[PDB]
Homo-oligomer: A and B are copies of this chain.
Amino acid sequence: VQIVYK
């Protein structure tokens, strides 16, 4: 589970 908001 890898979640990136950018």
Contact = CB atoms under 8 A, between A and B. Distances in A.
Contacts of A5: 4-6
B3 A3 contact: yes
Contacts of A4: 3-6
Contact size range, A:
under 10
Contacts of A2: 1-3
Contacts of A1: 1-3
A6 B5 CA distance: 6
Nearest to A5: B5
A2 B1 CA distance: 6
Nearest to A2: B2
The 10 A-B residue pairs whose C-beta atoms are closest, nearest first, are: A3-B3, A5-B5, A6-B6, A4-B4, A2-B2, A1-B1, A1-B3, A4-B5, A5-B6, A1-B2
